[PDB]
Amino acid sequence: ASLTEIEHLVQSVCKSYRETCQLRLEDLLRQRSNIFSREEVTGYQRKSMWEMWERCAHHLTEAIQYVVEFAKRLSGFMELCQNDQIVLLKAGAMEVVLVRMCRAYNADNRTVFFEGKYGGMELFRALGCSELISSIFDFSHSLSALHFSEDEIALYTALVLINAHRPGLQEKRKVEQLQYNLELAFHHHLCKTHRQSILAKLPPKGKLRSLCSQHVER
Ligand SMILES: CC(C)n1c(=O)n(CC2CC2)c(=O)c2cc(NC(=O)N3CCO[C@@H](C(=O)Nc4ccc(C#N)c(Cl)c4)C3)ccc21
């Protein structure tokens, strides 16, 4: 695992994310001024929990498809056995989607991109779990404060998937190998971009896990 190969990998993982990021950062940033009116927020608030569950389930399913696409493009992921790909995707996909959300979140006004415009947490009132939703909003708030770059997201979310301590892996060693190379890649690129400081401010992997389990329950 040499410097040029590690840099090959960094570039490779960032290309994969770019090709699978769902919406361009550029589009998200300039749409920030397109905010749901009071009448539209009320329109979403009036909807049944069952309709909101369906809309959200739809968007979430779509987001996971992009994450699977992302995984398929990661060097070595396809070389893993069929069972380990499932184990990694089942445990990790939703955690990736949660990290990806921070790109669509605006800390200035505490709003997120949903169905063509930005709105705040009150948009999801009909689901009837505001604790879960504010804590998701708080999570996305923390990551926006770091100013997570596209390539940071790519590299961090690669590591969220390729975790060799997910229960049920048949080839633990092959996954550790891949994890380690992605760890070197992540750390090398932080050096290169003078972004070492973000490591200590990342959320603990347990926080990210607990938050997805709570989401899964509802
Ligand atoms: C329930 C709600 C507060 N919520 C939300 O809870 N999460 C995190 C949970 C999946 C782990 C979001 O990431 C999220 C993102 C967004 N929007 C995006 O990040 N976008 C970028 C690209 O995709 C578009 C999109 O609609 N994405 C998506 C993904 C997942 C879920 C869910 N559930 C929904 Cl409703 C929409 C727009 C909106 C609400 C989210």
Side-chain angles (χ1 to χ4, degrees), residues 40-58:
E40 293 167 314
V41 170
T42 296
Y44 281 110
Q45 294 187 328
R46 286 229 282 162
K47 286 175 190 296
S48 179
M49 72 194 307
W50 287 99
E51 206 198 314
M52 288 302 286
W53 274 344
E54 278 176 37
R55 286 179 185 275
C56 291
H58 169 99

Side-chain angles (χ1 to χ4, degrees), residues 13-73:
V13 173
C14 294
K15 201 169 173 192
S16 297
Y17 182 64
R18 177 139 190 269
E19 286 162 1
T20 59
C21 60
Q22 193 171 1
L23 300 162
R24 281 133 47 74
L25 184 69
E26 186 163 10
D27 304 331
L28 293 166
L29 294 177
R30 65 163 159 73
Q31 284 259 47
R32 280 182 172 188
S33 64
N34 194 8
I35 297 164
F36 283 114
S37 73
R38 188 166 281 180
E39 293 85 29
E40 293 167 314
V41 170
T42 296
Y44 281 110
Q45 294 187 328
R46 286 229 282 162
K47 286 175 190 296
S48 179
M49 72 194 307
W50 287 99
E51 206 198 314
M52 288 302 286
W53 274 344
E54 278 176 37
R55 286 179 185 275
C56 291
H58 169 99
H59 296 302
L60 174 56
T61 297
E62 193 169 323
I64 292 162
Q65 289 174 315
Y66 281 96
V67 178
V68 170
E69 261 299 325
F70 174 65
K72 284 164 57 175
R73 293 173 202 249

Side-chain angles (χ1 to χ4, degrees), residues 22-23 56 59-60 63 94 97-98 101 104 112-114 124 136-137 215:
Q22 193 171 1
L23 300 162
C56 291
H59 296 302
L60 174 56
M94 244 206 289
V97 174
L98 175 58
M101 189 197 180
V112 65
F113 194 82
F114 188 73
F124 304 97
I136 286 160
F137 270 68
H215 204 291

